[PDB]
Design a protein around this ligand. Structure first.
Ligand code: SRM
Ligand code: SRM
Ligand code: SRM
Ligand code: FAD
Ligand code: FAD
Ligand code: SF4
Ligand code: SF4
Ligand code: SF4
Ligand code: SF4
Ligand code: SF4
Ligand code: SF4
Ligand code: SF4
Ligand code: SF4
Ligand code: SF4
Ligand code: SF4
Ligand code: SF4
Ligand code: SF4
Ligand code: SF4
Ligand code: SF4
Ligand code: SF4
Ligand code: CL
Ligand code: CL
Ligand code: CL
Ligand code: CL
Ligand code: CL
Ligand code: LI
Ligand code: H2S
Ligand code: H2S
Ligand code: H2S
Lengths: 618, 206, 206, 206
C-alpha cells in the first residue's frame, strides 16, 4: 500500500515486532497492529527516524556498549508481589514510583491474554501488569506518556525492545543527527527513558497461533490462569491443572528466528527465571541504574550461569541456522549485527571493510602481517593500507563479517579506529630509527593506546606524535598533538664561529658572527640538528621534551591546535583524560562537532581553563 | 617493485579508496592516482613535491594542504517540481547547508562543499547535479608549516596533467634554495598571482 | 564635501601619510589614494568594497586584509664591491632577514619584506635596489571574518586601475547575495584561481 | 483589525496609495481597495516584503540611482493612436508588444472612471487603457501576470508607483535578503519588470 523503507524488514520476516519504530514518528502516522504500518502517506517514504531506530537494520551495539560500560553481576531474588516468577520486576517498579525516580512505567497488561501497552503512574494500576504474556506486545504507551508530558519513565521490554530503545537513547550517535522534525517543525513527544528493565526471552508467539495451538490440546486460552516457558516446555495452568506442551510443536513469531539476544544484554537490569530456583527471579545487573534494584529486592548469590549460557548458545545456533537458510535460498538478510563490532564499515557495493586498528608507529612483525594476509585470503578480502598505517580489508560479505572479525580477535588483532571514539594514535619511527628523531615515539604511542584506545567521544578524536619538529604525522592539526623538541643554547666558551651549524638549519635561525654564533628563538623550532652538527661542543641543550598542541584537525576544515607547552608523559595522560571530559561536557552535536568546533563555540581559553582545573583536581 | 618516494622529487601520490569502494566516493581516485603516477613518478623537483587525491570533500588524504590537491565534488540543485519539503536531505548534511521551507528546500552555496550526500539521500528525485568533477588546489603543505593551497577550479584530467607539468616548470624556474624551498615558499616569495599566471600561460602554449 | 562611504559601494580609500611624510614611506600614498578615489569613489558593488594603500610593508592601514590592497615595497640587493660587513644594516631589520658574514652581508629573501630600511641605514653604499614598486593583494576583509587577500605581484598604477575595474566586474558577475557576500566570499565560492583568471582575461582585453 | 506594520504609514496620511506593497505578498493576503488591506492574519504582523518595498518608508534612491546611472534627455512627440496627450505611452507599449520585448503590459483601464489595473497582451485590449484616470489606481494586475507565468512586462506608473517598483527590482540591495518566502516555502510569483514608464504627476484624487 504505502512506500515505507522498513517494509524491507517487515515484509521479509526480519522484523522483531518490538514496536520501537512506531513510537518515534513525529507526524503520528505509524501504528502497530499485528505489525508496524503507515496510516497515511509518508512524504519521506520511510527514510527517517523509524528506520533509523530499528534494531534489525543496525544494532548500534558497539557504540552503545563502549558508553554504557556494562557490568554483569548475577543474583536471584523475590519481591513482595505475586508475579510470574519472583515478582521482582513489579516490586522494582513500585520502588521506583514510590521514591519518585520515575513519573510512570511502560508495562504490558492484558485483556484475556491479548497484550496491551500501558503507562501506569500508581501501584494499583501496576498490579494488573504482572505475569508474562508470551505473545506480540507493543510500546505504544510511550506515545501516550509523551502526550501526557511525563518527564521520566521506566520501560520493561523484551531484548528486541531494549535494543530498539537503546538506539532511541543514543540516536544522535547512531543516526548522526537530531530527532526527525515533523510537519510542524518539532520532534516527537516522548518521555525520557530513565530505566530499561529487560526480560530474558527465547521466543514469543502470534496470539492466533498460540490460541490455535492450545485448541489442539483441548485448552480454551480464555480460561488460562497463567503461562510459563520452562525447560523446553510451554506450561499452561487452567482449571487448576498444569498442562505441558513441547516448544518444538509451537510456531514462533517469524522474527524471533533472526534474533541473537537471549538475556537482554543492553538492559540496565535483566530479569528471568533461568538459573534461579522457582519462585525467584534471576537478576542480571549491568549498569548503575540497574544497581538501584538492590534497594528494592533482598538479592541472593548462586545463579546457575551455565543454564543461562546454554540458552544464549541455543538462540545463537537458531539464528545461524536461519541466516544460512536465507543465504541458501537467496532470501533477504539484514546484517544488523555487523555493528556489534568495532572497525567494520559498509562499502558502496554492499560488502564490508574491516579496519585493523593501526599498531603503534606502524610497526608490524612479519608473522603478524602474514596472519592478516592469511585471514584476508580466506574471506576473499583485498588489502588497503590507510594513511594512519592500518591494514584495512575490503570486500567482505555480510555473511562473513562476524566470523572474520572473531578470527582476527582470536589471533590477537583489534578491529577498530572507526566511529565516534579515540582513533588509532599516529606516530612516526622517532628516536633511534629516524636520524632526526628526538623522542621515543613508539613507546609514547603504545602508552597512549594502552590508556585511551577506542574510548568514546562525541565525534572522532585523533592523536599524533612526531619525533621532531618536522611533524611528518601532523600533530599541529590533530585533536591532540605531540612533537619532540630539543632547543639549543650557544656555549660562549666553546663556539668559535666556524659556521657549520647554520648550514644544517633549513629555516635559517642561526647568525654566525665573528668568532661566535647566535640563535633566533623567534624562528628556531627546536629540531636539535645544530647541536648534533657542531664539532666544537658549541651548542648545549636549552630545553627538551614533549611539545603539546590541543584542538586541531583536518578533513572538511583545517584547524591548527593551540600550542600549549612542554609536558611530561604523566601530564599528557592527565591532559587527554580531561580534554575528553570537557569535550563531552560541552558537545551538543554527536558525530558533527569535533573538539576544535566545541572549543571555537565556547571559547578556546574557557575550554582550556576548565581542562586545567580538572587536571589540578586529579 | 619500485623503491622510491624519497629525496627532492615527486613523492608517491596519496589517494583514498574513492568511488565504488567508499560509500561517500565521487570519483575514481585509484585510476586518477595511477595516471598521475604514470606521468610524474620520481620526477625531480627543487624539493619534495606531494600530490593528494580525495574521493569527496571529506578530504581524508588532505588535498587542501598538498603541493597539488584534487578533491571529487558533486554540487546539488533542487528540482522544484519534485522536492516536497520532506526534510530528509537536511539530516545528512553535517555542515547544515540545507534550508527546509514549506514544501521545498534550498541549498546555501556559501557553505555547501559539494559532497553529494543530499542527492543520494533524497527519496523523491528532488535534487539534481548542478556541477561535478575534480576540484583542484595548488601550493599547500604540512610539516614545519601548515599552508592551504590556493583553490583553483574544477579541471579535466588532461588539464590536471598539463597543470602539474607546468607547475613543476615554474617551480624550477623560481626556486633558489633546493631542498629548503617548497612550492608554497616559492609562491609566497614571488606572489601567488604571479606564479599561477605564469603556469596558466605555459598551459595555454601546451 | 561629499557625504558617503556607506552602503554597498566602494568606500573611502584608506591611505597612510607615505613617502616624504612618514620616514618609512616608500611611495606617494596620498596621490595614489587620490587617483583611486577619482576613478572609483562611490561606485556600486554587490556589498561594501574597501581599498587600502600603505606606504611600506609595515601596512599600518592593513592592505593585506582589504578587498584590494596596495603596499609600497623596495627590496635590496647587496653591492658586493662596497659591502664591508660593518653590520649596521642588520640592526635596523626587525625581522632579522640579514646575515652579516666576514667582510660582506646577505639577505634572506624568504623573509625580507622589502621595507628598504637597510638601504637607507647603510653608510657605505653597500645595498642597491633589487626591485621596487606597488605590491598588490586581492580579496581580503576584516569584520565578521578575517581573510588575507591573495598576493598578486608588483603593478603599475595603470595596471592597478585596470585591475580594480575588472575585479568589480567579475565580482558583480558571480555575486548572488547583495549586501551579504563580500568579494572574498565570491572568490571562495567559485575558486580563487577561477576568479583571478577571469579578471586577468578582462584586463588583457582592455 | 489584523496587525500590519505598514499601518504606521497608511494611518498617518503618509501612504501614497501606489499599491506596490500589496503585489509582493507570497501568501496573497494583501489586496488594495481604497487602501492596502490584510485579508487574514499575518504571522509576521507585516514585518516583511510589503514594508520593505514601500517607497514612503525609505526611498532607496541613492543606491538605485548609482546603478541605473540615469541620463536626462528631453523630447516631445505623438504616436499613432488617440491618447490623453500625444498617445505616446500606448504607442510605445504597442511597439514593445509587437517586437516581443514584453509579454504584456500593466496598465490602467476604467469602468466609468473607476480605475482598474489590467494585464494586456494584445493591441486590442491595450486600446481601452488610453487617457488619464486622475483617481487612485493600483498595480494589482502584476499579481495576475505572475499567476499566468508571463516572463516580462512593461508597467506604466505614477512617480510613487515607479519608486515602489524600483525598490522591488533592487530588493536584495535595499532589504539585504531574498524575497520573502510564503507558507509553502516559495516567494511571490511576479513577472520580470522590464520597462518602467513613468507619468508626470502633481496629484491624484479620491
Ligand atoms: C581509510 C581512510 C582513508 C585512506 O585512504 O586511508 C578513511 C576512510 C573514511 N573516512 Fe576518513 N579516512 C581515513 C583518514 C582520515 C583522515 C586522516 C587521519 O585521520 O589522519 C581525516 C582528516 C584528519 C582529521 O580528521 O583530523 C579523515 C576525515 C574524514 C571526515 C571529515 C571529518 C571532519 O571532521 O571534517 C569524514 C566524514 C565525516 O566524518 O562526516 C571521513 C569518513 C570516512 C569514511 C568512514 C566515510 C564513509 O565510509 O562513507 C571513509 C571509509 C572508507 C574506506 O574505504 O575505508 N573521514 N579521514 C583513513 C583511515 C584512517 C585509519 O586507519 O583510521
Ligand atoms: C616515513 C615517514 C613518516 C611516517 O611515519 O610514515 C617520513 C619520514 C621522514 N621524513 Fe617525512 N616522512 C613521511 C611523511 C611526511 C609527511 C606527510 C605526507 O607526506 O603525507 C610530511 C608533511 C606533509 C608535507 O610535507 O607536506 C613530512 C614532512 C617532512 C619534513 C618537513 C618538510 C617541510 O617542508 O616542512 C622533513 C625534513 C625536511 O624535509 O627537511 C621530513 C623528513 C623525513 C625523513 C627522511 C628525515 C630523516 O631521515 O632524517 C624521515 C625518514 C625516517 C624514516 O624512518 O622513514 N619529512 N613527512 C613518511 C613517509 C611517506 C612516504 O611513504 O613517502
Ligand atoms: C563608523 C565605523 C566604526 C568606527 O568606529 O569608526 C563603522 C560603523 C558601522 N559599521 Fe562598520 N564601521 C566602520 C568601519 C568598519 C571596518 C574597518 C574599515 O573599514 O577599515 C570594518 C571591517 C573591515 C572590513 O569590512 O573589511 C567594518 C565592518 C562592518 C560590518 C561587517 C562587514 C563584513 O563583511 O563582515 C558591518 C555589518 C554588515 O555589513 O552587515 C558594519 C556596519 C556598520 C554600521 C553601518 C552598522 C549599523 O549602522 O547598524 C555602523 C554605523 C555606526 C556609526 O555610528 O557610524 N561594519 N566596519 C567605521 C566607518 C568607516 C568609514 O569612515 O567609512
Ligand atoms: C515472551 C516472553 C518470553 C520469555 N522467555 C523467557 C525465557 O526463555 N527464559 C527466562 O528466564 N525468562 C523468560 N521470560 C521472562 C520471565 O517469564 C519473567 O517475566 C521474568 O522472570 C520476570 O518475572 P517477575 O516475576 O520478576 O516479573 P513480574 O513482576 O511478574 O512482572 C512481569 C513484567 O513483564 C512484563 N511483560 C509481560 N509480558 C510482556 C511482553 N509480552 N512484552 C514486554 N513485557 C512484558 C510486564 O510489563 C511486567 O512488568 C520471558 C518473558 C516473556 C514476556
Ligand atoms: C493622476 C495623474 C496626474 C497627472 N498629472 C500630470 C501633470 O501634473 N503634469 C503632466 O505633465 N502630466 C500629468 N499626467 C500625465 C498625463 O496626463 C498623460 O497621462 C501623459 O502625458 C501621457 O499621455 P499619453 O497620451 O502619451 O498616454 P496614453 O497613450 O493616453 O496612455 C496613458 C497611460 O496612462 C496610464 N494611466 C492612466 N491613469 C493612470 C493612473 N491613475 N495610474 C497609473 N497609470 C495611469 C494608462 O495605463 C495608460 O497607459 C498625469 C497623469 C495622471 C494619471
Ligand atoms: S514521517 Fe518520519 S518517522 Fe514517520 S513514518 Fe515517515 S520517515 Fe518514518
Ligand atoms: S524490528 Fe522493531 S523497530 Fe524494526 S521494523 Fe520491526 S517493530 Fe519496527
Ligand atoms: S526471541 Fe524475544 S527478544 Fe528476540 S525477536 Fe523474539 S520476542 Fe524479541
Ligand atoms: S617527525 Fe621527525 S623523527 Fe619523525 S619520521 Fe619525521 S623527520 Fe623523523
Ligand atoms: S655552535 Fe659550533 S658549529 Fe656553530 S659556529 Fe659555533 S663552534 Fe661552529
Ligand atoms: S634547533 Fe634546529 S631550528 Fe633551531 S637553530 Fe638549531 S638547527 Fe635551527
Ligand atoms: S575522501 Fe571521501 S571518498 Fe575518500 S575515503 Fe574519505 S570519505 Fe571516502
Ligand atoms: S530535496 Fe528530497 S530529501 Fe530534500 S526536502 Fe526535497 S524531496 Fe525531501
Ligand atoms: S552537497 Fe553535501 S554539503 Fe552540499 S547541501 Fe548536499 S549534503 Fe550538504
Ligand atoms: S605603512 Fe609605512 S609609510 Fe605608512 S605610516 Fe606606516 S610605517 Fe609609515
Ligand atoms: S650592506 Fe652596508 S650596513 Fe650592511 S654590512 Fe654591508 S657595508 Fe655594512
Ligand atoms: S628591505 Fe627591510 S626586511 Fe628586507 S633585509 Fe632590508 S631591513 Fe630587512
Ligand atoms: S505575509 Fe509577508 S508580504 Fe504578506 S502581509 Fe505578511 S509580512 Fe507582508
Ligand atoms: S507601498 Fe505604497 S500603497 Fe503600500 S503603504 Fe507604501 S506608499 Fe502605501
Ligand atoms: S502626487 Fe502623484 S506621484 Fe505623488 S503620491 Fe500623489 S499620485 Fe503618487
Ligand atoms: Cl534485536
Ligand atoms: Cl561520547
Ligand atoms: Cl630539480
Ligand atoms: Cl551592484
Ligand atoms: Cl514616493
Ligand atoms: Li650572520
Ligand atoms: S576517519
Ligand atoms: S617526507
Ligand atoms: S562599514
Amino acid at each position: 500500500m504505502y512506500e515505507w523503507k522498513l517494509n524491507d524488514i517487515v515484509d521479509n520476516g526480519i522484523c522483531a515486532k518490538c514496536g520501537t519504530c512506531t513510537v518515534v514518528c513525529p507526524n503520528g502516522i505509524l501504528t502497530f497492529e499485528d505489525r508496524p504500518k503507515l496510516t497515511e502517506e509518508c512524504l519521506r517514504k520511510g527514510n527517517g527516524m523509524c528506520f533509523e531506530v530499528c534494531p534489525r537494520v543496525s544494532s548500534g551495539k558497539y557504540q552503545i556498549k563502549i558508553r554504557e560500560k556494562f557490568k554483569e553481576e548475577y543474583y536471584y531474588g523475590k519481591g513482595d508481589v505475586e508475579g510470574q516468577d519472583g515478582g521482582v520486576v513489579t516490586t522494582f517498579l513500585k520502588y521506583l514510583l514510590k521514591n519518585k525516580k520515575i513519573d510512570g512505567a511502560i508495562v504490558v497488561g492484558d485483556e484475556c491474554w491479548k497484550p496491551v501497552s500501558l503507562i501506569v503512574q500508581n501501584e494499583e494500576d501496576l498490579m494488573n501488569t504482572t505475569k508474562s504474556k508470551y505473545t506480540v506486545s507493543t510500546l505504544e504507551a510511550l506515545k501516550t506518556a509523551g502526550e501526557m508530558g511525563l518527564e521520566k519513565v521506566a520501560v520493561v521490554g523484551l531484548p528486541c525492545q531494549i535494543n530498539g530503545l537503546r538506539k532511541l537513547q543514543y540516536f544522535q550517535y547512531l543516526a548522526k543527527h537530531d530527532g526527525e522534525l515533523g510537519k510542524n517543525g518539532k520532534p516527537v513527544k516522548l518521555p525520557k527513558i530513565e530505566y530499561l528493565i529487560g526480560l530474558l526471552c527465547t521466543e514469543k508467539f502470534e496470539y492466533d497461533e498460540l490460541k490455535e495451538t492450545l485448541a489442539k490440546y483441548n485448552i480454551n486460552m480464555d480460561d488460562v490462569e497463567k503461562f510459563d516457558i520452562k525447560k523446553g516446555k510451554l506450561l499452561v495452568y487452567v482449571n487448576g491443572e498444569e498442562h505441558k506442551i513441547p516448544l518444538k510443536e509451537i510456531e514462533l513469531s517469524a522474527g524471533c528466528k533472526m534474533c541473537r539476544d537471549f538475556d537482554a544484554e543492553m538492559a540496565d537490569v535483566s530479569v528471568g527465571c533461568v538459573g534461579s530456583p522457582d519462585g525467584y527471579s534471576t537478576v542480571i545487573i549491568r549498569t548503575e541504574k540497574g544497581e538501584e534494584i538492590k534497594n528494592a529486592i533482598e538479592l541472593k548469590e548462586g545463579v546457575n550461569l551455565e543454564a543461562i549460557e546454554k540458552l544464549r548458545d541455543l538462540k545463537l545456533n537458531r539464528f545461524k541456522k536461519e541466516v544460512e537458510r536465507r543465504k541458501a535460498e537467496d532470501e533477504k538478510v539484514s546484517f544488523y549485527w555487523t555493528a556489534d563490532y568495532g572497525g567494520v564499515g559498509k562499502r558502496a557495493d554492499g560488502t564490508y571493510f574491516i579496519r585493523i586498528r593501526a599498531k603503534p608507529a606502524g610497526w608490524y612483525s612479519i608473522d603478524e602481517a602474514r596472519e592478516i594476509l592469511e585471514i584476508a585470503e580466506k574471506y576473499d578480502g583485498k588489502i588497503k593500507m590507510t594513511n594512519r598505517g592500518a591494514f584495512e580489508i575490503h570486500g567482505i560479505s555480510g555473511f562473513d563479517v562476524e566470523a572474520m572479525v572473531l578470527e582476527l580477535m582470536e589471533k590477537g588483532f583489534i578491529t577498530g579506529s572507526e566511529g565516534p571514539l579515540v582513533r588509532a594514535t599516529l606516530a612516526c619511527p622517532g628516536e633511534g630509527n629516524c636520524g632526526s628523531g628526538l623522542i621515543n615515539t613508539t613507546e609514547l604511542c603504545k602508552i597512549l593506546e594502552d590508556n585511551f584506545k577506542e574510548h568514546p567521544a562525541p565525534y572522532k578524536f585523533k592523536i599524533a606524535i612526531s619525533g621532531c619538529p618536522n611533524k611528518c604525522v601532523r600533530p599541529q592539526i590533530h585533536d591532540i598533538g605531540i612533537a619532540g623538541v630539543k632547543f639549543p643554547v650557544v656555549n660562549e666558551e666553546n663556539c668559535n664561529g666556524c659556521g657549520r651549524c647554520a648550514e644544517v638549519c633549513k629555516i635559517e635561525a642561526i647568525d654566525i658572527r665573528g668568532e661566535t654564533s647566535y640563535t633566533n628563538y623567534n624562528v628556531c623550532i627546536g629540531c636539535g640538528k645544530c647541536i648534533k652538527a657542531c664539532p666544537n661542543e658549541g651548542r648545549d641543550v636549552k630545553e627538551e621534551g614533549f611539545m603539546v598542541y590541543v584542538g586541531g584537525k583536518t578533513g572538511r576544515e583545517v584547524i591548527e591546535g593551540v600550542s600549549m607547552k612542554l609536558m611530561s608523559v604523566e601530564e599528557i595522560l592527565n591532559l587527554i583524560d580531561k580534554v575528553l571530559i570537557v569535550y563531552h561536557k560541552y558537545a551538543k552535536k554527536p558525530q558533527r562537532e569535533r573538539l576544535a568546533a566545541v572549543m571555537a563555540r565556547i571559547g578556546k581559553g574557557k575550554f582550556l581553563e576548565e581542562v586545567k582545573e580538572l587536571m589540578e583536581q586529579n
